[PDB]
Design a protein around this ligand. Structure first.
Ligand SMILES: O=C(O)Cc1cc(I)c(Oc2cc(I)c(O)c(I)c2)c(I)c1
Ligand SMILES: O=C(O)Cc1cc(I)c(Oc2cc(I)c(O)c(I)c2)c(I)c1
Lengths: 121, 120, 120, 120
């Protein structure tokens, strides 16, 4: 069971390595249905982004995780297909859980999976 | 009519085309807003045709939204994602044919674009 | 045109069909050794048709091997995989139509099967 | 703790690690024959560590086979594939660290490799 409330991990399918320095923006949908900034960061050398939120701050609701894939590919001299990659999901609606959002990137393709686990507390 | 934009969806659990997946296509407007561009449901083939024409499908940023949540729920499955969206710039250099492919699983999905042109 | 066994290959890097990919299909014998069943190369559409017919495509275990190494090498890329292979038992139950789809990247690939109903 | 070769498997239907998946690793010989190299089963994390060491994991062509059929069948699911095979050349260009990742669905799977430089 992952100890991280909201972990984001990104891989590069072209190089077979972590996707380093990918800008990640997380938003939380409010009562009126609008998106508000929730947390932000960039992937480390491991391709993982640690420190997005504590369980206390990660309240029940719909979340949007945005990966700036365009800037990632353009920095390498590649003109990608997508404007960005977005993962939208409902979280903690049936008790608190720990989430890991994983993404695999290619210039014209991306895949994403989620690993949901229930912590000790 | 012609089809410069196509959407093809597969179901990874049943090993077949994803039927009745609700799709909504939007196009970015002059001042940054999204305007409804096209809509429909995937057929028995998992493909959605007749979305637009080469004349209507002009240069710009497009957003393709697949209602994966409803699709899985109607199959008695509680999926992870609310939906799956694909955002891209199209026809920035001429007028090509775009095929947005998607592979669905309850907690995962992959999407790929196949861009083509009248090759010889 | 093909009917029982089809192979479709896409390129996730270039956003296009993977053309001229060498495909080899093997089949398990009575004892337990692989045996050449069919071969070909993907066309411009990224598809390989005419591998067999409903008559020769009998029940058993098959192995579809895609020469991905040569595909990437020709583009100047040194991929991870020696090749991509799909092993499955076919027509064990009913004689349906099989489509093996593959999405390729230098260090990654995904394969999916679409088994179509013989009745409807 | 592991270092040279690691295997990680995820379940796309349940959104969790794929536990107890049987893994068998083979290494090619001089005449092109495969010989047993290492084997084990994924733990609760969905990972398999300690398959080999740097001294043991020398240059060569390896074959990593995941028994995906048994995994799905045990859950009552009828999968398409007999297994998922990952064939690759290793340590040819210096002794690196390899991570073979796989995401499983009943009728589909994707595999990715993460190659890193340890004390390079
Ligand atoms: O393909 C998809 O649709 C989803 C997906 C994305 C990634 I990126 C994966 O790879 C890893 C590799 C390591 I190393 C991890 O620790 C984790 I969590 C996921 C896998 I499997 C599946
Ligand atoms: O237009 C048609 O005749 C139908 C069609 C189009 C494409 I493009 C296909 O290729 C793939 C390969 C993989 I791997 C996928 O996950 C997906 I979604 C589509 C297939 I099969 C069938």
């Amino acid at each position: 069971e992952s100890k991280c409330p909201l972990m984001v991990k990104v891989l590069d399918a072209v190089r077979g390595s972590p996707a380093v320095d990918v800008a990640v923006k997380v938003f939380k949908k409010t009562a009126d249905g609008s998106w508000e900034p929730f947390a932000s960061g960039k992937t480390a050398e491991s391709g993982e982004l640690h420190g997005l939120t504590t369980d206390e701050k990660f309240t029940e609701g719909v979340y949007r995780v945005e990966l700036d894939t365009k800037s990632y590919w353009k920095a390498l001299g590649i003109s990608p297909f997508h404007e960005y990659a977005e993962v939208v999901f409902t979280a903690n609606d049936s008790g608190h859980r720990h989430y890991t959002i994983a993404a695999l990137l290619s210039p014209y393709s991306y895949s994403t999976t989620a690993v949901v686990s229930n912590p000790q507390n």
